[model samples]
Target chain A: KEDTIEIAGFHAHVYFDAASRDVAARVREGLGARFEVQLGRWFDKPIGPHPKGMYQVAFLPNQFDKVVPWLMLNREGLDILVHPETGDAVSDHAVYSLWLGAALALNIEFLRQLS
Target chain B: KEDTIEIAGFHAHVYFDAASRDVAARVREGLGARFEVQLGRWFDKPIGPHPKGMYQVAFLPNQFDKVVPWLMLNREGLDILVHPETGDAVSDHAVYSLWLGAALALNIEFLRQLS
Candidate 1:
């Protein structure tokens, strides 16, 4: 089965903890404060497909530059889940999920991203 | 054409406005402070699939009771996007995306969710 498709935007799940909440918050807030990007809800617990202490951040297609590298430099010690919004939720979470920290196993079953 | 799939959890997207920041914040904070659910990151703007001012909320299968109704009664004017974690991101955001506010046409494509 092939999954060649177009993209709408992209998603990045920032993984953190009680200890890194502040770090994650700083990046979360900073992204909004700095860019005109769309943000997702923050998960304080382990939700579907995602590990514990994860939050979502979204942006348009061309905005990749302003977001990711920024995080790589500023994210401190938190892990991040970055993937493209290829109009395929299942593949995005399973086959497309990219990590900026420790890789976490996502439930390829149900997922859900934006542009 | 059947989606008789079991769920690992659920996800909810809350739509807000500059005015409803407080409402979103209260719900986001209250849910975490009051209950034990996984919270996604707060979107400061419109991302993919989701319309503007949308935030995600996720919980376990059994915790539904602790959430939804409370929001139905307490969410004020803020709209929410609710869906099941049936191991299919696209479907969850599209097929299973149950809304509590204005229905948003999610980019059912790159959904790329929680339990």
Candidate 2:
């Protein structure tokens, strides 16, 4: 028999660097104006397992298609990691995550502890 | 100025192998029953730029939020590539694509020549 995973919500970490900081801001602002999302702070330095600086764009399960598809078109060349909150932080961030643009490596050990 | 790419439609390529082909079929059946999708042929061999055996799930822009989020939860451990139809096939498959589960390497040069 097949199984199903329950998704409570989602977090889309929008990664950027010095060259594209401005672009990331524009994308953040666009997301804020267009959808109901909890916009996270700008991390100028690498935090947690994330290799680059990124801010988070979080929304409910209902908004996945709305926000993500828009991000696919208007990411303006930024890499974003979209993952579900399934009560397993490690698998949620590593195994069950989605990528818009390029996929980035996360410190799995970091996520494992959180799991 | 900020810009947005017009998405005419979207294609989600669901990839699987000998071990997971039955699971892929169940997913295909689930998708057909649950959403309005144009399900494509089941490729026993890799075709196009795809490196694995797979099938295509094509849908209109409106069904994105519905189909994709469901896919996020119910992909059943298969690697899937979701991309937009932005006229530029090369960038659409290579750059402007989203991955669910693991990101797979495409034969990008093959995609480029088709461009």
- DockQ (C-alpha based) per candidate is 0.01, 0.48
lDDT of 2 by residue, B27-98 (tens): 899999988899999999998899999999999988887678778778889999999887888888987789
Model 1 TM-score on chain A: 0.85
lDDT tens digits by residue: candidate 1, B1-115: 1222265676768888898888788878877876568788888888877767767787875655446545544566566766666666775565444444445556655455332
Query: Which CAPRI quality tier does the interface of model 1 achieve?
Result: incorrect
lDDT of 1 at B45: 88
Best by lDDT: 2
User: CA shift at B53, candidate 1, in angstroms?
Assistant: 46
True-structure lDDT of candidate 2: 0.86
**Total clashes in model 2, counting residue pairs 3 or more apart in sequence or in different chains:** 1
i-RMS, each model, one decimal = 19.6, 3.4
Q: Which ten contiguous residues of candidate 1 chain B have the minimum total lDDT?
A: B1-10
